[PDB]
Amino acid sequence: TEGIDYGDTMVVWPSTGRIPGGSMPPGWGDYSPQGIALVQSVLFPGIIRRIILDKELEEGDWSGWSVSVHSPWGNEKVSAARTVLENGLRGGLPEPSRPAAVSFARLEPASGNEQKIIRLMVTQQLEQVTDIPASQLPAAGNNVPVKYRLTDLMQNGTQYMAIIGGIPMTVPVVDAVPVPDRSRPGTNIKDVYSAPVSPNLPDLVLSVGQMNTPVRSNPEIQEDGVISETGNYVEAGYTMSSNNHDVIVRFPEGSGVSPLYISAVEILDSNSLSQRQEAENNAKDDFRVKKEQENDEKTVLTKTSEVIISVGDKVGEYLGDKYKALSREIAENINNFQGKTIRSYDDAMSSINKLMANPSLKINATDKEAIVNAWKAFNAEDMGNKFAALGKTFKAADYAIKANNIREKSIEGYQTGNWGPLMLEVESWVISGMASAVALSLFSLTLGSALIAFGLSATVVGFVGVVIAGAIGAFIDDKFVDELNHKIIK
């Protein structure tokens, strides 16, 4: 499964394939008639094991997979990686809203020369990966909330196995089913269950019978191609290999067998590593780019909102409170305008033509002269620099140029009554590639933060409070330019 999890911010790397790359029927060898393949290895929690599909098919055995589940025993490396993960998590995540990882084993690349489908499996008791009682686990085929996960880490083209954690993660609950005894029909094999640890591969057989037997076979358990090394609080990977999975295997009805978390990884070969490292490198930088894009968009929209409300307040204690209410609306609309598109050129210019058509919306030559001269002294260059003496508002002073055009073009329009150069320059910004929301902010910010700073009389501050409100209005909605004419100017 995959579910609601959404890979806890991870994109899929469609796996290399599964190497294979360089007598019948099953049962004939010296094996048990029960039907299950030999019990090839023991699954102690935290200790990684190299498990082979059809380990001994040709040697005579039955089809598949079979491992033994055992209680805590021996030297495992997860508990040390968990300690570094927990400690580092007290100092915040590497990257917010993305899990944190610490390696517990390093992997030597597969030769590619293999016929067998190998799989590295790691095991953990329920409680070590989650605080939900066994007794409160979901019904199989649903994801259970987890706190730790055991998966892999592509770190510098070499594949690692790590413990992730830190954000709200989730894991699929799957179902262990009793396996039938092919030698004694009607009855099932005692204390042997099968579960879809999978993926694409046949169900793993779990022999849970002799879970507590004496194990006096050296606490190390050194696998070939699995170097056990602890290492450092890093950010987790961005791609999940298609053939890798971790699930919580839930045992039957009255089995008396507590849920096991199991992780099944695919050892990637030398050219598949490079494949995955660029998949990684690319998923990382694109996330990085989307992140700043949206954050910086959010900050110029919140500062615009605030400036549009201040304009509302200043023009408001002269033009009225019906004017203040409209500014709440334009600022509300801008503060949510993320992802939206400004209105068209022909639609906006029909709106401001409607405003400027209102005959009780006039200025005398002395007031007109004051607005023009106020724009002539405007410091376009510092309005450009604002992403520094405001906060982190826009990016790169290529904006000083745009801010100077709004200026020269607001001057015309007050001078000629032609707002075409002004409205057209704003569209230019979008067309040559600016996000509508960012183009709305710069326009609204340049107009608003110039008005709350102009040395102008109240008659004039009212006229410009109407012009710039009808102008920011027109790129958002025609509602805004009807409220002005019909309820405010009159």
> Of 238, 211, 249, 223, whose CA–CA distance to 129 is shortest?
249
For residue 473, give every residue at least 6 positions away whose Cβ sits within 8 Å of its Cβ, in sequence order, or none. 330, 351, 479, 480, 481, 484
Q: Residue 215: how many CA atoms within 13 Å on its side-chain side? A: 19
Residue listed under structure tokens 């790169």? 396
Read off the DSSP letter of residue 489.
I
Cα gap 186→459, rounded to integer Å = 97
Resolution in Å, one decimal place: 2.5
Q: 142: Cβ–Cβ under 8 A, 6 or more apart, which residues?
A: 3, 172, 173
Contacts of 332 (CB under 8 A, 6+ apart): 305
In which element (H, E) is residue 191 found? strand 188-195
Torsion of CA 223, 226, 228, 229, to 10 degrees: 170
Among residues 263, 249, 308, 250, the alpha carbon closest in space to that of 446 is found at 308
Task: Kindly state the tokens that stand for 471.
Answer: 């102008």
Nearest C-alpha neighbor of 252 from the set 142, 134, 369: 134
Provide the residue ranges of all domains of the chain, joining segments of one domain with +. 1-269, 270-490
**The token pair that represents 463 in the structure block:** 């006229």
CB 80 within 8 A of CB 104: yes
Q: 237: which DSSP letter?
A: P
CA dist 196 → 140, 250, 341 (Å): 11, 11, 47
- DSSP designation for 75: -
Kindly give, in sequence order, each residue whose CB lies less than 8 Å from that of residue 76, ignoring residues fewer than 6 positions away: 44, 45, 46, 47
Would you tell me how many other CB atoms lie within 10 Å of the CB of residue 192? Answer: 22
Q: Which residue has the tokens 């001057």?
A: 411
Q: Which two tokens stand for residue 60?
A: 């005579």
Q: What separation in angstroms does the CA of 362 have from each of 251, 270, 417? A: 82, 75, 11
d(CA 466, CA 463): 5
255 CB contacts (<8 Å, ≥6 apart)?
176, 193, 208
Half-sphere CA count of 417, side-chain side, radius 13 A? 10
Q: Which two tokens stand for residue 250?
A: 């839930």
* C-alpha–C-alpha distance, residues 307 and 299, integer Å: 12
For the segment(s) 270-490, the CATH number from 3.40.50.300, 3.40.50.620, 1.10.490.30, 3.40.50.1980 is 1.10.490.30
Q: 258 Cβ partners below 8 Å, 6+ apart? A: 125, 126, 134, 251
Q: One-letter amino acid identity for 196?
A: P
Strands 226-227 and 66-69: unpaired
237 vs 21: CA distance, rounded Å: 27
Type of residue at 477:
D
DSSP 269: B
